[PDB]
Amino acid sequence: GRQKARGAATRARQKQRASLETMDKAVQRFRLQNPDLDSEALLTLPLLQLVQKLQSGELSPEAVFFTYLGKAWEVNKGTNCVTSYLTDCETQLSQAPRQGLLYGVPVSLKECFSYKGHDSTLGLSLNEGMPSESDCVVVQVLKLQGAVPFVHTNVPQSMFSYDCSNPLFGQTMNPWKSSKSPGGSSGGEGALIGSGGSPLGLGTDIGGSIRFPSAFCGICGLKPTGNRLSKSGLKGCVYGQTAVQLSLGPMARDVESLALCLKALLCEHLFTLDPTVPPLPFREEVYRSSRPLRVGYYETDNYTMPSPAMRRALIETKQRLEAAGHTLIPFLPNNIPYALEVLSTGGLFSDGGRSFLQNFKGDFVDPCLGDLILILRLPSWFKRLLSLLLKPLFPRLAAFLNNMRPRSAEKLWKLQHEIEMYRQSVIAQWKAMNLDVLLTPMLGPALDLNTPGRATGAVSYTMLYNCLDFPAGVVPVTTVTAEDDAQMELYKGYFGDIWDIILKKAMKNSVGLPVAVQCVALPWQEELCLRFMREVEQLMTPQKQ
Amino acid sequence: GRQKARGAATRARQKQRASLETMDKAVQRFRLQNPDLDSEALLTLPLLQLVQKLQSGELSPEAVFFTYLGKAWEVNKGTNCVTSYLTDCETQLSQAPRQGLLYGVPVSLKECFSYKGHDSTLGLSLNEGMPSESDCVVVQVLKLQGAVPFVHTNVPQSMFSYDCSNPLFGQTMNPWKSSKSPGGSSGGEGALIGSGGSPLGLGTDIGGSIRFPSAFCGICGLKPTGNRLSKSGLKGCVYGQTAVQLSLGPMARDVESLALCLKALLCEHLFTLDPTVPPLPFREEVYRSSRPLRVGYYETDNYTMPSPAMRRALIETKQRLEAAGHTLIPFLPNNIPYALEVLSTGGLFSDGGRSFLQNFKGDFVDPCLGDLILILRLPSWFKRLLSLLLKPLFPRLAAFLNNMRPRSAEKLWKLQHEIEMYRQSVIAQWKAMNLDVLLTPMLGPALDLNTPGRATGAVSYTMLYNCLDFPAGVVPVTTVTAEDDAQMELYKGYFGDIWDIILKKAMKNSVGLPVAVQCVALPWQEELCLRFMREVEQLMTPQKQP
Numbered sequence A: 001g002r003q004k005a006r007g008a009a010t011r012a013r014q015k016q017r018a019s020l021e022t023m024d025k026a027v028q029r030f031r032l033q034n035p036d037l038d039s040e041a042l043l044t045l046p047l048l049q050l051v052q053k054l055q056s057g058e059l060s061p062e063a064v065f066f067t068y069l070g071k072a073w074e075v076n077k078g079t080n081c082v083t084s085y086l087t088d089c090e091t092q093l094s095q096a097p098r099q100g101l102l103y104g105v106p107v108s109l110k111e112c113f114s115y116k117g118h119d120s121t122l123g124l125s126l127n128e129g130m131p132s133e134s135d136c137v138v139v140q141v142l143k144l145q146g147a148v149p150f151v152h153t154n155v156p157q158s159m160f161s162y163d164c165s166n167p168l169f170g171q172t173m174n175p176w177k178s179s180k181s182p183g184g185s186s187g188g189e190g191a192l193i194g195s196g197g198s199p200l201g202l203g204t205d206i207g208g209s210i211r212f213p214s215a216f217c218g219i220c221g222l223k224p225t226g227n228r229l230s231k232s233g234l235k236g237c238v239y240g241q242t243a244v245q246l247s248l249g250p251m252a253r254d255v256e257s258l259a260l261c262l263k264a265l266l267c268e269h270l271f272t273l274d275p276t277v278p279p280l281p282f283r284e285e286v287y288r289s290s291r292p293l294r295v296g297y298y299e300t301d302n303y304t305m306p307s308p309a310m311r312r313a314l315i316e317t318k319q320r321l322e323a324a325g326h327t328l329i330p331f332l333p334n335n336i337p338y339a340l341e342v343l344s345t346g347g348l349f350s351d352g353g354r355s356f357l358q359n360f361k362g363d364f365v366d367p368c369l370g371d372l373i374l375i376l377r378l379p380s381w382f383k384r385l386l387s388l389l390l391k392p393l394f395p396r397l398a399a400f401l402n403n404m405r406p407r408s409a410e411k412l413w414k415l416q417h418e419i420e421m422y423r424q425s426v427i428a429q430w431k432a433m434n435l436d437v438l439l440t441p442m443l444g445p446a447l448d449l450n451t452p453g454r455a456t457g458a459v460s461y462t463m464l465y466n467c468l469d470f471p472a473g474v475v476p477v478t479t480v481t482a483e484d485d486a487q488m489e490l491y492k493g494y495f496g497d498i499w500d501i502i503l504k505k506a507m508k509n510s511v512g513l514p515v516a517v518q519c520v521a522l523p524w525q526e527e528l529c530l531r532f533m534r535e536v537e538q539l540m541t542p543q544k545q
Numbered sequence B: 001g002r003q004k005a006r007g008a009a010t011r012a013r014q015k016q017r018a019s020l021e022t023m024d025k026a027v028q029r030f031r032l033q034n035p036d037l038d039s040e041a042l043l044t045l046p047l048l049q050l051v052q053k054l055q056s057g058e059l060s061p062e063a064v065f066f067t068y069l070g071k072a073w074e075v076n077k078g079t080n081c082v083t084s085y086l087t088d089c090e091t092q093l094s095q096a097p098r099q100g101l102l103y104g105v106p107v108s109l110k111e112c113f114s115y116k117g118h119d120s121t122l123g124l125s126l127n128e129g130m131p132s133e134s135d136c137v138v139v140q141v142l143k144l145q146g147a148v149p150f151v152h153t154n155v156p157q158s159m160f161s162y163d164c165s166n167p168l169f170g171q172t173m174n175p176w177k178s179s180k181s182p183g184g185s186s187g188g189e190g191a192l193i194g195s196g197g198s199p200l201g202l203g204t205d206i207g208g209s210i211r212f213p214s215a216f217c218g219i220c221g222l223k224p225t226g227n228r229l230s231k232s233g234l235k236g237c238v239y240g241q242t243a244v245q246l247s248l249g250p251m252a253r254d255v256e257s258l259a260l261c262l263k264a265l266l267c268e269h270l271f272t273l274d275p276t277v278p279p280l281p282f283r284e285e286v287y288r289s290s291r292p293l294r295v296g297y298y299e300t301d302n303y304t305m306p307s308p309a310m311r312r313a314l315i316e317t318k319q320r321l322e323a324a325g326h327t328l329i330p331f332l333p334n335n336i337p338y339a340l341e342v343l344s345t346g347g348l349f350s351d352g353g354r355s356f357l358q359n360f361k362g363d364f365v366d367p368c369l370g371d372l373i374l375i376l377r378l379p380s381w382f383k384r385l386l387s388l389l390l391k392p393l394f395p396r397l398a399a400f401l402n403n404m405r406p407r408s409a410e411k412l413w414k415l416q417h418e419i420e421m422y423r424q425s426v427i428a429q430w431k432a433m434n435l436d437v438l439l440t441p442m443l444g445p446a447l448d449l450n451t452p453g454r455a456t457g458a459v460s461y462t463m464l465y466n467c468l469d470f471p472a473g474v475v476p477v478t479t480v481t482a483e484d485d486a487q488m489e490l491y492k493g494y495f496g497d498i499w500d501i502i503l504k505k506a507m508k509n510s511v512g513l514p515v516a517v518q519c520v521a522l523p524w525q526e527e528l529c530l531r532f533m534r535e536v537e538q539l540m541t542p543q544k545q546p
């Protein structure tokens, strides 16, 4: 029976179509009244300058809103990144608090950021036609800071994916190349911000879901420490999994934009609306520091062989940092295989997938999820026998499979404790070399559509820091050259298993696509992390001031 | 076989004896050289004044250290609160950083605060002769702030108890009345600080273990939000249970001492030594505020009927707050039975007790734990059958028994999510009435020895805030009167089960014993919480000296 799933799809498509139609009408009505508005001047302004002109009165909020609405609508045509037009938002426009740190700034939202009167489907049939009954906390704070949230953007079915397709709204494409994934689970945001259609957005990230789409689409993203920001009111599909913690964070065209966004969120409105978040205000002094940095670095995690473009990105950044006076120290977190295979996978799937799979009862399984659902459905004894068979030839596959089995509360306790010990073990490493920050590769360039679901190993660069729960952001530093792309033909991977084979093929045909590096700091050091991101932005892409 | 347990007891008792003997020799040697030191003047100084005089140079650190060491040794004689003399600590004395916020202050440590070269036994055989390899983080911070940690103090076997006895170092007694429990699991500290033998100490608290001993021994304690202070290096016996988190916090003779101790701990040293703790510095402006407060309150949680002393303590505090200009708003957190029976008990024993019971293999089970170990050992089906049998008669006993069973990772996720939602439910309730703070009763007067283990129900007043993970502190406000004590003979309890019956008997003969109220704020509001504790202290113990 798929009648219910087909009904949901038909309806979701109707709403998305209607929303885009409403956007078109609003944009045309505005343009007829403002024939002389220099829209490209306004669209190309960096957020900081846009904000200052909104604040001075030089730009009206309406001019900014409708110009950006027009561009969002245009870029959606080739990306399918927008799922819904947040229908209140013009009335919010007219009432945006004037002294707010984000006054007059349109902000895009990953679909799971609950918004009153709108579904947060996550691409699942069961969530369709169940509108949210209030704004989640961070949407409330944005609004109290004068921001104007205006679209929900697309995500892969269930959000447990670094691709971006679902059976409801379909497939989001990379704005730089249609055959490529925008990444995700925050892929809508990546596609939208990456093509100029929103100056600022929020995403979420449990295995790389802010960082993948940022990297793949050539923009900036920060995954803070999990509890730096509020997850109150967020839509999700598994509840009470605390071993590997969700984080929510900003995505934007530059580092300053992420900094401003954090500064606006980390205010009294957030702290009182959600007392469970520690009231740590944005430390501007740490963000603005120009002190030389002790920067740890690795060019590979020995788990996912990096692409030629990834490796060159890393070495060139290393080199410009050295040239600017920073100390670059080789550093690799210990026991990565164990963090990924036992701690991260086990933490994410301690119950064998059963809670997660309830979401798919009755539903279609998007092709971009691959065989994940098929695998999770297998009984525990079969996952185990399969694991023992695969171990000698494909130890990685064997490891994930074994750790995706159900267990007792007793074993989850043991797992939670190991996560905590691992965390302190890397902190210890870090302190022993006296690092300030850590520079790593970031998976790049964008994989072809429907391949992230088949290259699970490639999450190693990002998931490590979900497991450690350290702040981690990504900055675009280069684009893939023909030379980089030709060298993929020599890429073999460290394991030679199906994940390596698919990644080889998936990263081909990527000339001109953006490639990032990743910046990490210790827990609660989001300001230092951003300070480091700002430095990399400056040295590698000087033109983004 | 208890041959190993007996061996560990014999050794631990030798060490304790040797420790105390070393303390005596050091005290005697000092006193010989300082015949004209007014030790009572020095002992009776409040910590803030003591700190200032250490800081000016008017009192030497040696004077303060040895005078306090002498008092500790004296009060131990009738309390058995000291398990070990922290042997480095005279060398640390000589090297204590002069600009440190706690320069020259002797500090007592609950035995689970790891200290280089010493066991943290927790009263368990299996931890004896396994000396800690370094100081835990908060001990390091204390030392970097110029403090001088000097004794490990006693705890009930495993710490999972609000009495204070174990098979290794034995039973700690209340300094006010030796037939009474000092409370605990931080009972050593309560007994030591409560009789004058230490001006400041740190304890831990997962179900009330800072607040019970503070309340029972007539002193102050704060249980902060769990992750306000670093737990790195703390000794425990259950690993990876994150549903109901442990919290560490100060104990002292007044509120200002708690404030100073939090201020000294919340510095860059702690934050960089344990990056997992959010670097929230102590907000003095919030602590020193004298704004009128919206104070929620209840005289009873409808779970544990309060003793007459508890209820009067609560109403008199309510009344003085109103007299002082604060708004007192009736308020009771919703669904307390659920939070205690399902959320707290389940989170604490999600695995049916199996990890916890590992600690007791081969060991004696201290009488003061009651039947806890016997009940955890019971197979799951039998816990369940027993529970259905008890349900009609004793629903409370039935509930705990049912929620003490093992479950899957899947159900723990559901539970962890329920804890998180309940937390938000109470927060919403709290915001709906626009409270600043909450005033509740606090269990007591001190129960007789070996009865906390049989009055599990009486953790209701404190464990609620472990479950909610709100900062909660206790302040002494009155002592039990003849009239309060006479009225316990009419105490029936709300359930009439064996826990109500034992509490009635256990609080008997308590004239003169201290009785506290409890102060709560929202998560991360330790400064507001302490501000409110200060106000109750000012109104109810006006003769509490500066």
Ligand SMILES: *[C@](O)(CCCCCCc1ccccc1)c1ncc(-c2ccccn2)o1
Pocket (backbone or CB within 6 Å): A158, A159, A160, A161, A162, A184, A185, A186, A204, A205, A206, A207, A208, A209, A210, A235, A236, A237, A238, A246, A344, A345, A348, A372, A400, A456, A459
């Ligand atoms: C996003 O980070 C997910 C990226 C894809 C990670 C797949 C990891 C994996 C590991 C082992 C086996 C298979 C796959 C992301 N952002 C939000 C969420 C999310 C998911 C579910 C509930 C709430 N939030 O994932």
Ligand SMILES: *[C@](O)(CCCCCCc1ccccc1)c1ncc(-c2ccccn2)o1
Pocket (backbone or CB within 6 Å): B158, B159, B160, B161, B162, B184, B185, B204, B205, B206, B207, B208, B209, B210, B235, B236, B237, B238, B246, B345, B348, B372, B400, B456, B459, B463
């Ligand atoms: C302390 O808070 C314990 C107070 C007693 C709580 C008993 C609650 C209970 C009993 C039976 C059934 C259900 C609930 C305290 N402080 C520290 C610790 C501790 C214990 C074990 C390991 C580490 N820390 O308990």
Ligand SMILES: [Cl-]
Pocket (backbone or CB within 6 Å): A227, A278, B227, B278
């Ligand atoms: Cl936290």
